[PDB]
Ligand binder design. Structure first.
Ligand code: NDP
Ligand code: NDP
Lengths: 222, 223
């Protein structure tokens, strides 16, 4: 039996991942929402598949992160596969036109949030069997891709977390952790369904650390 | 053909050495900043002997200080030819699990937001100058593609984050004929601040291409 943890499971790719894991036998899922009482789809997911555990997490909120280990510990002794999915993408375009609040929000939500979350949940991952750690990144976060778009605070935040993900992969290799940054795809666009199926395949199959992977299993340049 | 340079963090280190270097060049006005000018002994003595050097207050962690830098710099000049974001911190190294919340925050505000805000406020002054050059003092530690077998924690992340945004800015301002660079000033191979400042000042003067990540010696670094 394996415990997966998924932040931001109330809608989008996160809901799609939880819905697919729920179908796989011997999988417990800790699923988070900012507001689990409004998370209508996820609550019915969990009611029909009670191996899905619905927990409060706001990744912008240090008081919420300071509770996540307790909240997860209610349902499990360990985490096999940790997935930092919950994130924002509110600010694009030129730097001269990106205000202070946009830079601050993407940093706290998209960089600090996931680092604090991983810090809080490391003890539980440590005790699990798979020791897999996924941060949902974006190809927009590469220092070495040109989309003909500016990504402002969004891109900056994905590049920032990518830098720390790379370091974390190095730091935990001695502990046999598998650490990855994964672009979930453009969800040519793709459905949350497709993104999620590809994401679950990669989560199960990935056997080496320090990779930056697109959903299809191919590598991206940091 | 008089030029104006702006150097943040000129009270000590590389920044002091850059201002000292520029102070020796004929036709070069230097706006030099310190968080606490009253205690900037060496920079004040330089400025007392060399009236081309203007000392102004700036705390790049402090939005209230940033909201004032443009009007304060404008008392001393109508334009900036060469903008150098040098002031920065480096206090957070080693593993992610040992780096507390406050270190990630401080490096973001001082090393990412500060320089971005400082550039936002000084852009009109720079647009009005001739050279239109914009330097961010980065680190080779900020590269997503260099391995030094060291952890750089929040310091490294802050330099990578500012690098990402520097690369974007170079694209955005290419049509306005700006030159934008991230520059590694060296390990201050061990070099002195004065050695770094001599190399940096040659590079500021000579660089005629935008979007480069460079070392002090003018060689390129991978993003
Ligand atoms: N979709 C795409 O094409 C691309 C997206 N990505 C990555 O994909 C992920 C998006 O996943 P998906 O669920 O489909 O996205 P959605 O846009 O559908 O929604 C974002 C998710 O994050 C949650 N969330 C937002 N802010 C917070 C917060 N402060 N605290 C807690 N939860 C929060 C949302 O919950 P709530 O409903 O409460 O807001 C929701 O679950 C991101 O990690 C992003 O980096 C990367 C590249 C492109
Ligand atoms: N030294 C090296 O080997 C390397 C240096 N660098 C970069 O080179 C640049 C210069 O480094 P170095 O001279 O050694 O730095 P120092 O540590 O010697 O000093 C940094 C400078 O920034 C100022 N400063 C710090 N915080 C603030 C703030 N909140 N507001 C305004 N000014 C501030 C300091 O003023 P105060 O006296 O008030 O603290 C000082 O003038 C930095 O951007 C640094 O990151 C990068 C990698 C290698």
């Amino acid at each position: 039996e394996q415990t997966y943890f998924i932040s931001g499971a109330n809608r989008g790719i996160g809901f799609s991942v939880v819905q697919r894991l729920a179908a796989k036998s011997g999988v417990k899922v800790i699923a988070t929402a900012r507001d689990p009482a409004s998370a209508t789809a996820l609550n019915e997911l969990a009611k029909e598949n009670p191996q899905v555990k619905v927990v409060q997490l706001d990744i912008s909120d240090e008081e919420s992160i300071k509770k996540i280990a307790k909240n997860v510990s209610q349902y499990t002794d360990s985490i096999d596969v940790f997935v930092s999915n919950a994130a924002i993408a509110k600010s694009f375009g030129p730097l001269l036109n990106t205000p202070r609040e946009q830079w601050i929000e993407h940093f706290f939500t998209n960089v600090l949030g996931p680092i604090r979350l991983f810090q809080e949940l490391y003890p539980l991952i440590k005790k699990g069997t798979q020791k897999k750690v996924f941060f949902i990144s974006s190809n927009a976060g590469s220092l070495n891709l040109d989309f003909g778009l500016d990504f402002s605070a969004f891109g900056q935040s994905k590049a920032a977390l990518n830098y720390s993900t790379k370091e974390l992969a190095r730091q935990l290799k001695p502990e046999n952790f598998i650490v990855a940054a994964v672009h979930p795809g453009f969800v040519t666009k793709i459905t949350p369904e497709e993104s999620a199926a590809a994401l679950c395949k990669l989560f199960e199959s990935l056997n080496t650390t320090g990779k930056y992977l697109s959903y299809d299993g191919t590598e991206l340049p940091w």
